[PDB]
Symmetry: C3
Subunit: 441 residues, 3 copies
C-alpha cells in the first residue's frame, strides 16, 4: 500500500508504505574449483581440438596465479557519509586461506561432499563449496589418452566443463580480482539458492534472499583468493540483512522560489534532506544518494554503509519545517530555473520564469498548465509532464496521493536580507544570518 | 565545419558547428521468444549432452520467472537538474502485458509472422517481434526422441539456438531485469535495424538511427517483462529523436585568477555554465554534465532528461559576460591551482603560482611556455600540453580557432571586498555583495 | 612497510610507506586481424552449420564497418581538476591509418611475421600485431568446399577461431567503438605480455607492467579503428608509467566538531585535502578522488590526468595545519553528524550528539566506546567499528599506527564569529572573515 503526500509549503513530497531490507553485515563463503595438474603431451582433427582446449585451461590457471601476486583490493548530502572498505571482511578471510594448514583443511572437508562448513585457523566458521571438479574429470577421462584415440563427443563436453573456468578467469582479468555483481559463473542460481539455504540465518532472511536473488547478486562481491595444491579458491561475500520489514519512506524535494516578474529579483530555497529514510533501531537510517537503494515492489534494499543515522525527529520537517526539535537542512540560491521531480505516485513541478510546464494524458495531451511556483500533480489521470524542452514520464504504479495545501515558506523571507548561495545550511542557520544583516542595517 | 573561439576576458572557449540529435521521447517495442514447455525424460555420450543442454534451458526459464516476482525498476551545474524515471514508459507497457487478454493477443499476432504491430488493452500500439522460436525447434526436433537415437550435428545446433536464451537470462540476472546498453542478445544488429525501419517515424530519423546503431544501443533499455503461456517477453525501450540538426556548441571554462607574487593574495573566478548547448524550440537546451552527450563526427547525441531549458540569451555571456539581458553564472575562490582544459580544437591553460605549463609538438618538444594567467593554444602545430606533472594530449580534429583578446575580468574586482567561496553565484550576485561590504567600510 | 599517524588536532590520518606507479603517458599499438573476403555460395546438417557460422562472420564485418562511419570518441577537491581527452592520442594514430598508403604499409609488414614495428606517414613508430588470421584459415580450408563435402571436426574449429571476432565485434557494439578495460578478446594475456616485452621501455617498466597485467588492462583503451583491404585494425592505447617507486601516502580526513550539549550550538571543521599524495618531480602529485587510484600490495597506480600538482610544502598541514608556508584547505559547517572513515591501518571515528560509536573484536564484541568528539583506533585488536546503525569492517593489513595527541583546533574558534557553510576555504580565509565580523561588532 503506497501513498504519497505533497507539501506545498516546502515543495517536497514523501512516499510511504515501503518495507526495509538493509544490508547490515557480510557473510563470507569460500567457493572452490578442484584443478588437474598435468604436464602436456601424433596429430589429427579431434584431439588437436583437445590439445587446443587444454592449453586454454593451463593458460587460465597460470594467468590466475599471475593475477594473485598482490593482496586483493578495490577502488545532496552524500558528501556527509563516512568511508568504508567494502571487501575488508572478505579480504580478511582470504588472508587466512594463505596459511599452511588452511588450504588443505578445505581440500579435506570437500573430498566426500560438495558443501561443508569449515572452521578456520582464527575461529572463522565459513561455508565452503566445491562447484566444479576439473581434476577428476580430467584425470579420469582426458588423462588416459599414443596420443590419438578419441572421439568428438568428449571434445564438446570438455569445452563445456572447462568454459566456466575460462569465463571466471575472464571476469577476474578485467576486474583486478574483485567482481560485483557476482555472476553464476562464480555462483550459479541453484548454487546460490543452495548456499543461501545452507547459510545459518533466519528462515525469514532465507525467504527474502531467495525471492530476490537478482538483488543479492548486485550486493555481493567475488574476491579472487588463492591457487594452491590443485584447488582454486575465491571468496564470495554476501549481504546480511539485519534490518527487515521496518517502515521506509522516500523524500523528494525541488526548489521553491519567489515568482516576481523582474527576473533576477527572486530568491529560492531547497530542502536538502532528500533521499530514502527507514526506521532502524530507534533512529532513522538516512540514505542521501537515493540511487544506491534498489526497490522491488514495495521492498527497499539499502546498504547502511551509504547511510547516516539520524534522530527519528528528522521526520518532523515534513509536516513542520519550522519545528523546534530538529533543525531542517535547506539550501538557498537566487537561481530560479525550472525543473520537475518524478515521485513514486506523481510529479513535483518547479516552474519559474518564462518556462512552459504542463501535464498531459495518453489520449488528450495537455490537461493542466502549471503557473509559476512549485506545484504537484498525481499520476492518476496523468501520463507525462513537460518542463521546458524536457518530457518526463510519470510512474504508473497505483496508490493514492494527498495534496497538503500550505503557504510556500519562501514568502516569509525578506529578499533584501536573504542569504543566497548557502548549501549545507538549515532553517536556524539562515535565520541567524538574517538577524545579523538586519542588525547591521 | 568545426570552429572555436577563446575569450581571454573570461578564460573560456566555445566550439561550434555541431548538429543536434536530442532524445526527446521513447518508443516501446515488445520482443518475444517462443518457448517449449516440456517435462524431462538410456545413457550415452551424445544425448547426455542434449540432456545437459536442455537442463540449462529449463533452468534458464525457471530463474527468469523467479526473477520476475516483483515489478521491474532501476536505480558544475548538474545539481540543478530535475529527476526523471527513465523506464517509467517501458514499465507502463510491461504492466499491461500482465492483463489476461494481453499476453495471448501477442501470441496470436506473431503466429504467421515475426514482426507485427499490436494495439494493446489501453490503446498503446506497440511493435512486437518474435526473435527466437525455441518451441517449434524443440517440438519438431528434440521432442521426437527410447531416449537414445541421435547424432552430434543436432547437439551443436541445439547449443547454438539455445545459447541466446542462456545469455539473455544472464544479462538479466546481473542487472535485476533492466539492462542498458541493449545488446544483440536482446536485439541483433539486423533485428534492430529492421525494427528501426519498421518503426513509424520520419525517414530522416530512420537514416539517423540506422547510421548510429551503436549510439541507439547505449541510449536504450531492455526491461525484463513476463513469462506466460510459453512466450517470453521483454520490452525494449528505444530513443525518440524529436530534435535533429539544430545548432550545437560546447562551452569550456577554466579558472581565471590574479597573478600577484605574494601567494594567497590572489582571487579567482570561474564561469560555471560550462557544458553542451543546443538550440531547441526557441530556447536553449543546456547539458551541464558534458559527459552524458555522445559525439559522433559533428553530431551530438543528448538526452533532454539531463538538460535545463534556458533563454537563448544565455549565449550572450560568451561575448559579454556583463550583458544586461542574462545574469551569467560564475563561481569565486582564492584557490589558484594550475590546470588545463582540452577543448575540441585547442587547449585552455590556467597557469598559476610556480607551476610549469608548456605546449609541445611531436618532433620538437616545447614551442610555447605559458606565463601566469589564463591562456589558450590551438591544436594546429601542437600535439601535447603540460601543466605541472600532468601531460594532456590535444584533439587532432581539424578546424580553425580564433583568439579573442580581452582583459581578464578578474582585474576589475578589488581584492579586499571580493567575495571568495561563492559557488552558485552570478555576475550580479557578486556585485551586490561587493556593494554591501563597500558600504559597511 | 605500511605505517599510519592520526592527528587528533585535525581529526585526520596519513598512511605512508607506499610506492608510486603513475601513468604519465600513452603507448599506441595497432592490433590487426586479417580477414577473408568471400561471396557466399546442397543442404545437410554439417555445413548448414558452417553456412550458419559464416553468416555470423560476414555480419560481424558489416556491422563493424557500419559502426565506423564516424571518428571514434568517448564520454572533495575533485572539482579542481582540469579536463583531458583520454583517447586523443589513440584517435590521432587511428586517423593516420585512414590515409591511402598507411593501411597497406601494415598489411605488408606482417605478411612474414605477427609482430612488427611500423613507422607511419607522420613519423609515429607504432608496434603492430596480427592476432588472428581468418583469411588464410578460411581460404585454405573453408574455401575449397558441390557445397557438401565436410566433417564436424572443422565446424567446431571454425566456431572457435571465429568466436574471437564475434566477441570483439560485440564489445564494440555496446561501447560505441571504445572499450576499457581492454579484454583478451582484444588482447590475450600472452599477447599483452609479449606486446609489453616488445615495447621499447625500461626493463623496470616491463617487470612492473608484467607483474600487474590486470591493472594495465583497467588503464588501457581499445579504440575501434578501420576495416580496409581485408585487414581489421583497432588501436590499443596502453599506459606509460613515467614515475615509479616514489613515496606515496594517503590522507584521510573526517569532520572535527565541538561537543556542546545544547544541540545546534556546535561548529564543525573538516580538512578538504584528503586523497592520495605521491612525490613527483620535486612537487607533489595530489589525487583528490582517492577511488581513481588502484592499490596492489604497497604499490599505488594512479593517473596524472586526475591529479593536481602541488608544492611539496602541502605535506606541512599534517604536522602543523597552522604552518606559515602553505594555506591548508578546510571546510566549515554546523552539521555535526556522526560517521567513521576506515583508514589503511585503523579507523577514524567522528562521534557527535546521541550517536553510539564502538569498536569491537571477533570474539568479544565491544572493547572501546567512543565519547563525543573525533577519535581513532588501530586495526590491531579491532575487527569492526560501529557508528550509529552502520557497521564498518576495518582492514586487517598489518602495520603500525601512531596516535599523535593534540588539541582539536576547533576549540580555538569563537562560535559566535565562526563562518559556517564555507567549502573551498582555508585556514587563512577563515581567519580573515573572522577578523571582519569581529571588527564590525
Ligand atoms: N560545509 C558547508 C558546505 C558543504 C558542502 C558543500 C559546500 C559547503 N559547497 C559545496 C559545493 N557545491 C556542490 O558540490 C554542489 C552539489 C553541486 C552545490 C550546490 C549548491 C551550492 F551552493 C554549493 C554546491 N559543497 C558541496 C561539495 C560536494 C562535493 F565535495 F562532492 F563536490
Amino acid at each position: 500500500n503506497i501513498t504519497e503526500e505533497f507539501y506545498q509549503s516546502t515543495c517536497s513530497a514523501v512516499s510511504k508504505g515501503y518495507l526495509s531490507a538493509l544490508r547490515t553485515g557480510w557473510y563470507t563463503s569460500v567457493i572452490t574449483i578442484e584443478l588437474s595438474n598435468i604436464k602436456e603431451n601424433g596429430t589429427d582433427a579431434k584431439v588437436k581440438l583437445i590439445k587446443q582446449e587444454l592449453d586454454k585451461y593451463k593458460n587460465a590457471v597460470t594467468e590466475l596465479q599471475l593475477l594473485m601476486q598482490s593482496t586483493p583490493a578495490t577502488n545532496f548530502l552524500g558528501f556527509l557519509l563516512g568511508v568504508g572498505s567494502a571487501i575488508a571482511s572478505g579480504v580478511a578471510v582470504c588472508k587466512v586461506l594463505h596459511l599452511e594448514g588452511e588450504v588443505n583443511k578445505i581440500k579435506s572437508a570437500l573430498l566426500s561432499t560438495n558443501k561443508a562448513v569449515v572452521s578456520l585457523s582464527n575461529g572463522v566458521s565459513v561455508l565452503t563449496f566445491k562447484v566444479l571438479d576439473l581434476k577428476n574429470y580430467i584425470d579420469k577421462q582426458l588423462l588416459p589418452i599414443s596420443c590419438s584415440i578419441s572421439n568428438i563427443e568428449t571434445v564438446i563436453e570438455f569445452q563445456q566443463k572447462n568454459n566456466r573456468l575460462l569465463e571466471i578467469t575472464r571476469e577476474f582479468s578485467v576486474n583486478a580480482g574483485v567482481t560485483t555483481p557476482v555472476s553464476t559463473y562464480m555462483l550459479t542460481n541453484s548454487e546460490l539458492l543452495s548456499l543461501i539455504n545452507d547459510m545459518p540465518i533466519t528462515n525469514d532472511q532465507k525467504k527474502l534472499m531467495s525471492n530476490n536473488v537478482q538483488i543479492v547478486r548486485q550486493q555481493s562481491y567475488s574476491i579472487m583468493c588463492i591457487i594452491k595444491e590443485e584447488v582454486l579458491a575465491y571468496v564470495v561475500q554476501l549481504p546480511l540483512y539485519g534490518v527487515i520489514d521496518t517502515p521506509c519512506w522516500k523524500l523528494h524535494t525541488s526548489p521553491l522560489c519567489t515568482t516576481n516578474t523582474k527576473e533576477g529579483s527572486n530568491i529560492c530555497l531547497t530542502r536538502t534532506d532528500r533521499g530514502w529514510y527507514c526506521d532502524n533501531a530507534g533512529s532513522v537510517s538516512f540514505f542521501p544518494q537515493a540511487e544506491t537503494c534498489k526497490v522491488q515492489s514495495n521492498r527497499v534494499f539499502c546498504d547502511t554503509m551509504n547511510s547516516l543515522t539520524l534522530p527519528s525527529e528528522v521526520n518532523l520537517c515534513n509536516v513542520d519545517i519550522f519545528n523546534p526539535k530538529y533543525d531542517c537542512k535547506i539550501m538557498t540560491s537566487k537561481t530560479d530555473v525550472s525543473s520537475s521531480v518524478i515521485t513514486s505516485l506523481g510529479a513535483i513541478v518547479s516552474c519559474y520564469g518564462k518556462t512552459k510546464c504542463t501535464a498531459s494524458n495518453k489520449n488528450r495531451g495537455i490537461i493542466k498548465t502549471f503557473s509559476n511556483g512549485c506545484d504537484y500533480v498525481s499520476n492518476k489521470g496523468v501520463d507525462t509532464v513537460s518542463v521546458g524542452n524536457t518530457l518526463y514520464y510519470v510512474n504508473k504504479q497505483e496508490g493514492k496521493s494527498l495534496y497538503v495545501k500550505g503557504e510556500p515558506i519562501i514568502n516569509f523571507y525578506d529578499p533584501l536580507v536573504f542569504p543566497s548561495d548557502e548549501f549545507d545550511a538549515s532553517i536556524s542557520q539562515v535565520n541567524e544570518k538574517i538577524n545579523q544583516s538586519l542588525a547591521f542595517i
